[PDB]
Ligand SMILES: CCCCCCCCO[C@@H]1O[C@H](CO)[C@@H](O)[C@H](O)[C@H]1O
Ligand SMILES: CCCCCCCCO[C@@H]1O[C@H](CO)[C@@H](O)[C@H](O)[C@H]1O
Ligand SMILES: CCCCCCCCO[C@@H]1O[C@H](CO)[C@@H](O)[C@H](O)[C@H]1O
Ligand SMILES: CCCCCCCCO[C@@H]1O[C@H](CO)[C@@H](O)[C@H](O)[C@H]1O
Ligand SMILES: CCCCCCCCO[C@@H]1O[C@H](CO)[C@@H](O)[C@H](O)[C@H]1O
Ligand SMILES: CCCCCCCCO[C@@H]1O[C@H](CO)[C@@H](O)[C@H](O)[C@H]1O
């Protein structure tokens with residue numbers, strides 16, 4: 001099938017970045033146009049990819065079945081409800097009714113997905129030590145944080161905290177075994193771009209947290225940022241190894257973390273906490289997503305995007 | 308010996324459920340009679356099982372020695388001081404002096420037990436990867452949370468927080484390796500009922516926390532509930548696999564988590580946080596413990612309770 | 615080379631203990647003289663060891679290269695910037711300018727060190743399961759906590775919280791796999807003194823936390839102390855096994871945890887939280903570091919200190 005499921009990282013990153021710029025509109029009015037443009041592009045890409053995945057389900061179902069039952073590849077399916085919710089979050093600025101439908105569909109969908117598949121892993125004998133990949137964060141962590149912030153947008157703050165807690169504790173519970181595995185077992189080049197997902201947890205976490213707690217930059221938020229930056233520095237040092245075999249579209253795996261660096265930066269700035277660091281983070285993350293967009297346009301022009 | 312040590316889960320669940328109903332007496336006065344009945348039954352069962360275990364120690368000591376030195380079976384011994392403290396907590400409503408004696412005996416006992424046995428594991432060569440079982444939560448986590456809430460009942464809030472922290476961090480430190488093990492290694496049917504202990508940590512944690520913090524349903528409490536419900540949903544989906552080889556008395560392993568869902572629900576309700584979810588949780592957990600009681604009466608009638 | 619890198623634990627422990635006594639000066643004025651004496655001795659030892667390590671770098675570089683590339687021995691190098699910062703913290707009482715230079719040198723140095731080496735481990739194939747040692751806490755955890763408290767001393771509280779969060783989450787993320795490894799694999803006698811580093815995380819954590827949060831002994835601080843004491847009790851029970859093959863200078867590995875027990879005790883006492891426990895902790899930790907000093911003087915007199 002021409003669209004790899006991981007390509008949903010593209011509308012993910014663009015949508016999350018739209019939301020970051022939305023949050024600067026009262027500081028700088030021109031930010032709203034930037035936000036609206038990113039949000040429209042993200043939503044358009046999302047519509048296309050959803051329609052493609054619907055085609056995959058109807059006409060390439062055995063491919064979906066295999067990816068679903070894989071103890072590694074199943075995780076990327078979580079990008080579908082994650083991006084559904086982020087597009088709902090964008091659309092809320094124009095039509096809260098349609099936004100709320102998408103947010104609930106994505107929330108119910110992700111929770112059903114993890115409840116069916118993530119739990120099934122605990123039966124043993126399918127997941128192996130070599131299945132311990134960064135992509136596991138998507139259904140386990142990122143999906144819950146996205147529900148948390150989306151439900152908060154709709155006014156469901158206490159429900160949002162339930163999802164937030166599920167994501168935060170799931171993160172802390174998985175990461176220890178992931179990092180140990182990475183230390184011992186060299187992740188093969190074909191999977192290395194997924195190291196970008198390692199950037200996500202702390203930044204997604206703090207972004208979701210600030211979405212639910214009325215943007216109060218408190219001790220927890222600062223603690224999360226600190227570990228987030230540690231991981232950034234580690235991944236920056238590792239970047240040449242990450243791309244040993246060349247630049248590829250899989251690098252959009254970094255975009256959840258990058259866009260969430262941008263979003264959380266707007267809240268730190270608004271709160272007058274570490275404004276200088278905030279400006280750095282916001283500019284850095286925009287530049288890197290900008291480079292992702294330029295490499296993507298390049299690939300599309302050369303006919304090297306779709307399978 | 309006719310009584311398996313794990314049968315202490317029975318008075319555990321009944322006692323904790325008594326405490327949950329106790330907490331509804333000011334909302335609904337009739338809750339006190341329900342609480343008192345459960346508490347008396349729990350205490351009676353506890354007396355019987357303690358006397359049986361005393362008989363085991365005196366006359367079947369090599370069985371106790373073997374269970375103690377086992378890197379898997381040692382954990383169930385922690386049920387003894389846990390239930391001692393919970394019975395003390397019940398009895399506090401009638402006789403705070405006797406209650407305080409039981410609470411200190413259970414606290415000193417559990418701390419000595421873990422200090423002797425849990426630490427010894429760090430010498431290596433005895434505990435194996437296959438020893439990584441949910442039962443490890445009992446001495447490591449549940450016992451500290453029970454001390455925390457019991458000491459808070461007696462007015463020792465800051466000491467309670469020390470025990471609370473020991474339990475909470477011990478939980479977060481063990482669970483990562485447990486879930487990885489479950490993913491890789493299929494837990495054999497003879498141990499699967501112990502999957503019920505996986506329900507316990509977040510719910511016991513929040514119940515203990517709310518016992519020490521004057522029932523303030525805050526961000527931490529909501530975060531814990533969220534992960535607790537995630538685990539519930541996972542265990543509900545796994546339940547047919549859990550009971551693949553049939554229903555058994557080991558299912559009382561679920562009762563710490565179920566009773567703590569009930570207890571924490573009363574505090575969320577009192578705090579006007581997620582009242583609807585609270586009512587669901589309280590009813591659900593009571594119904595499931597009710598089913599445990601019905602299956603137990605059935606087994607006793609058929610002569611299939613004691614070994 | 616005559617000085618093992620681990621000997622930097624000596625000025626570490628003495629320096630941290632100086633800081634603990636400094637914090638009692640307003641309660642008991644004579645504490646300042648004790649603090650100043652420990653601080654001068656710590657600083658003198660530090661100067662000597664730094665000059666020795668400079669000699670090692672210039673004239674024994676291949677030894678440094680090998681220790682740096684080792685997935686186990688690299689960690690002890692982090693003691694160098696850690697102690698640089700602690701000596702800066704001492705010197706702040708006399709010369710804030712020189713203190714600030716040392717604190718930034720140690721902060722930049724430790725962050726560069728971990729960014730280069732800790733991240734490199736994630737490439738796989740070098741670190742092995744048997745590399746999972748307590749010493750990993752030094753670059754990963756202790757160095758960040760030391761930056762946190764040192765930057766707070768200089769007035770950089772929000773930056774301090776970033777370092778604090780990096781250390782705290784790094785701790786929680788490593789400890790699960792460490793304790794599992796210790797359970798399964800018996801740590802060989804030649805490394806067992808490093809079990810003392812297991813005492814460090816919770817106590818260093820709470821000490822750093824209280825340094826940044828204006829000494830407010832809150833729920834987090836109490837939670838940390840509780841797990842800290844759990845680990846102390848475990849290590850006390852394990853102590854005969856730790857020293858199975860005899861007392862050795864490696865036991866200074868305990869001093870980060872002991873000195874941080876002392877420091878945090880002063881803050882709990884100041885806050886009127888668990889004063890009795892605080893007095894116990896402060897006396898205990900001073901006595902144990904005192905014994906370390908006596909065994910060290912003994913070794914120096916017998917010519918058994920330097921390699
Ligand atoms: C977007 C998510 C895609 C879902 C793919 C579902 C794969 C399910 O797959 C199948 O479901 C059947 C029952 O319905 C079983 O009988 C099949 O054996 C099982 O493979
Ligand atoms: C991502 C949006 C929602 C996910 C829908 C997934 C539905 C999966 O379908 C299910 O797969 C199971 C296996 O785990 C089968 O056993 C079930 O019979 C079937 O319900
Ligand atoms: C896994 C890492 C979890 C760390 C959680 C940090 C504990 C929250 O820290 C709390 O922040 C509050 C608001 O700023 C303060 O009022 C409290 O004093 C402080 O304890
Ligand atoms: C996420 C962070 C993005 C925020 C972008 C802020 C860029 C504004 O820049 C700031 O403008 C201020 C007045 O507006 C000046 O006082 C500051 O010195 C200047 O740094
Ligand atoms: C309720 C808990 C039951 C405790 C069982 C204790 C098992 C101890 O067992 C024994 O202790 C002796 C020392 O006293 C040793 O010499 C024995 O070799 C050791 O097996
Ligand atoms: C559960 C209530 C309290 C528990 C009491 C346990 C006492 C265990 O007994 C001990 O077992 C040790 C091994 O770890 C032996 O080495 C000791 O000599 C003995 O003190």
Ligand SMILES: CCCCCCCCO[C@@H]1O[C@H](CO)[C@@H](O)[C@H](O)[C@H]1O
Pocket residue numbers: 168169172216218219220221479525526527530
């Ligand atoms: C392992 C998961 C630990 C998460 C700890 C959550 C940090 C506590 O969260 C804190 O709650 C306080 C009371 O509601 C608020 O005042 C603070 O703003 C908030 O930071």
Ligand SMILES: CCCCCCCCO[C@@H]1O[C@H](CO)[C@@H](O)[C@H](O)[C@H]1O
Pocket residue numbers: 569572573574576585586589
């Ligand atoms: C742990 C939760 C158990 C609490 C049980 C509450 C059942 C009461 O039910 C509630 O009664 C209220 C007045 O009392 C009505 O206003 C509410 O609509 C109704 O839901």
Ligand SMILES: CCCCCCCCO[C@@H]1O[C@H](CO)[C@@H](O)[C@H](O)[C@H]1O
Pocket residue numbers: 678679682691
């Ligand atoms: C206090 C810390 C000591 C640092 C020791 C550094 C070890 C680096 O070592 C070397 O660096 C070179 C590049 O500079 C490489 O070419 C070498 O192959 C590599 O071994």
Ligand SMILES: CCCCCCCCO[C@@H]1O[C@H](CO)[C@@H](O)[C@H](O)[C@H]1O
Pocket residue numbers: 691692694695723724726727730731734
């Ligand atoms: C402890 C105080 C600061 C630490 C300085 C460490 C400098 C290490 O040096 C580096 O080692 C690398 C390998 O990881 C080499 O690849 C690099 O070329 C070199 O920069």
Ligand SMILES: CCCCCCCCO[C@@H]1O[C@H](CO)[C@@H](O)[C@H](O)[C@H]1O
Pocket residue numbers: 475476479523525526527528786832833834837
């Ligand atoms: C890994 C363990 C992390 C536990 C973090 C504890 C959460 C912080 O606990 C918070 O402390 C605050 C200050 O005392 C209180 O105001 C809040 O009510 C409480 O939730």
Ligand SMILES: CCCCCCCCO[C@@H]1O[C@H](CO)[C@@H](O)[C@H](O)[C@H]1O
Pocket residue numbers: 876879880881883892893896
């Ligand atoms: C880290 C803890 C070190 C603090 C040492 C405190 C020793 C003082 O001791 C205390 O003195 C008080 C008046 O000063 C008396 O009221 C107390 O009863 C006594 O315990």
